[PDB]
Copies of this chain bind each other. A is one copy, B any other.
Amino acid sequence: AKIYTDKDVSLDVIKEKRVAVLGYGSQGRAWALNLRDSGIKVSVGLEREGNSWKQAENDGFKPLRTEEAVRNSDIIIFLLPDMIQRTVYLERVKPYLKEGMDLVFAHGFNIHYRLIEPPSNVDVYMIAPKAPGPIVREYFAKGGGVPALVATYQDHSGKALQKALAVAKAIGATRAGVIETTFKEETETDLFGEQVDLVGGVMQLMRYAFQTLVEAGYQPEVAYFETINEMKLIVDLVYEKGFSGMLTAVSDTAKYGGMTVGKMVIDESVKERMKKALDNIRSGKFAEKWVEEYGKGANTIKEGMKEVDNSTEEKVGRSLRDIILRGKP
């Protein structure tokens, strides 16, 4: 697939545009800081004069209520939680849209699932950096940057890909590299990864391994080092060198064990259930169910966070993190 880097993209297409960054969480901050450093006129737009508003004041912005930021801008960037974008949009963005304005997202969920339904006469596009806000910012600030995906949903102007690329350049992404996708692809793949692998899957895998050891009578601190803490070593090596690289770096005892037992533990029925999860994303069932849960108060999340907070593993983990911090220079 085509990879775009600094050289392939001009800022001219957004240089003269006023950008509203809606939100000043971890992403909103990073983007607002990078855009402003790249010479883009940024207004931060916020629903409340709360902690976010203060943080933005602390960074030399003068924040505005959402609607005032929108009325004074050309390019509107939604860096708000997915579940509250709909309400902010309808009440504080929609009535202010004019021909030729742009709606810009970091995630495809709301557009793809019709929670925000834009008019036909604006451009709609996305830049999805592949790192946390702090890194997005740090790397840009050191003359590098983080890769991202870009997509266009509605290209009314004919320049929507160029504009998406320019935004991505202004936040440092083209220093690393950018690849084009679609709103649908980014949404479905992001939901799938989070559910089966990145958050759901690996958390349950690590937690089961930890529990198995503690239930068999081994020391909890030993069990935590072996099943949770060491995972960084492994995943750092995959990130840096691929699986091949990682496998070369571990013992032959580890390779033999991982190759023979790994597939018995994570067997074909797991893959079959991942297919089912993907089917549930693709049919819309997952998004329907989540929107329904959220509408009832997200009690699943509250109960699960309480269980994690009070678990044995969390207690043990805290203690080993004091030990690691104690020796970190």
Contacts and interface: CB of A to CB of B under 8 A. Distances in A.
A255 to B, nearest CB: 5
A223 interface: yes
A179 B314 CA distance: 18
A177 B282 CA distance: 48
A172 B265 CA distance: 36
Interface residues of A, number: 136
Contacts of A5: 326
Nearest to A277: B261
Interface string A279-302: 010100010001001100010110
B258 A188 contact: no
B238 A261 contact: no
A146 interface: yes
A317 B238 CA distance: 9
Nearest to A323: B177
A318 to B, nearest CB: 6
A155 interface: no
A175 interface: yes
Given A247-B305, A290-B257, A179 B230 contact: no
Nearest to A177: B323
B326 A242 contact: no
A226 B189 contact: yes
Copies of this chain in its oligomeric complex: 2
Contact of A199 (B145, B199, B258): B258
Interface string A230-254: 1111111011111110110111111
A209 B219 contact: no
A11 interface: no
Contacts of A211: 271
A295 to B, nearest CB: 12
A116 interface: no
30 contacts: A26-B249, A132-B233, A138-B329, A142-B329, A144-B328, A149-B222, A175-B326, A175-B327, A176-B327, A192-B209, A193-B227, A194-B253, A195-B258, A196-B209, A199-B250, A200-B257, A200-B259, A201-B209, A201-B258, A203-B258, A204-B270, A207-B243, A208-B270, A231-B238, A232-B235, A243-B308, A256-B290, A256-B298, A261-B277, A264-B277
Interface of A: 1, 3, 5, 26, 81-83, 109, 130-132, 138-139, 142-147, 149, 172-173, 175-177, 179, 181, 185-186, 188-209, 211-213, 216, 218-219, 221-223, 225-236, 238-244, 246-247, 249-267, 269-271, 273-278, 280, 282, 286, 290, 293-294, 298, 300-301, 304-305, 308-309, 311, 313-314, 317-318, 320-324, 326-329
